[PDB]
Amino acid sequence: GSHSMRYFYTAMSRPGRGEPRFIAVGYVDDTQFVRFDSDAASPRTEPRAPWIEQEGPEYWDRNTQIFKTNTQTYRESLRNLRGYYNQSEAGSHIIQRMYGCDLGPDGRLLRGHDQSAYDGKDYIALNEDLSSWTAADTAAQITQRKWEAARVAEQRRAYLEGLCVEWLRRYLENGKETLQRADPPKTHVTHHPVSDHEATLRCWALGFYPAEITLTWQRDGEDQTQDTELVETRPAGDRTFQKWAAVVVPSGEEQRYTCHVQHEGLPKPLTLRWEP
């Protein structure tokens, strides 16, 4: 199917408690594969998925250098943004960066991404054209002007259309037994009387990969969107994810309710009902 690679950087200042901490993690789809943490005893890029372990020492050395350089760049950037917002030296602040490439089912570049936030609010983003920027405010306009002056977008475009796709395609091949394997959800419906004339029907999806799933309740074939409690999809810790959707129904009316499940790993969509 489709696939993506992303790097996620977080730089966090902490005045009085040393230099800002820089973390980087890398994902392919919903699978993390590398990490770097400037607070580690001996900071170096470390593997987090088995299929990346086969990469050689130059790879790990290249990654580590890159992240050590970023550590110092983001420290300067935090000092710069503090300035742009006339903020005190006293507070903690966070820059987050996301970037990477999306591929379509054929392996072709679908689009690239590069976006940043400051204190959890959008700050600046590379537009889909991979040429121009969208700046959130007059501070980010300073960054935009700097990046326009240094032709950052052109360099971003080159990476996103080139190395990003090249390396993603490699990882997809090297990790093909997992990254290109969709594990369908295991599903079932549970019943929990609430009172004499209401019960909860909870539909479960367990053990699935990737995390993308649709899980709805219908009553008489009509979506019960407002009435369904739908928990956030959550990691099981073994690469797979879990989710449930619950509806409170009138006693005796359980069979006017159906749980519908859509997921890549399914030979076909499921329709489930409580089975007393």
Partner: peptide, 12 residues
């Protein structure tokens, strides 16, 4: 693989 980014180009 992450992008190589010199500080003099990529600083905010």
């Amino acid at each position: 693989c992450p992008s190589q980014e010199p500080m003099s180009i990529y600083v905010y």
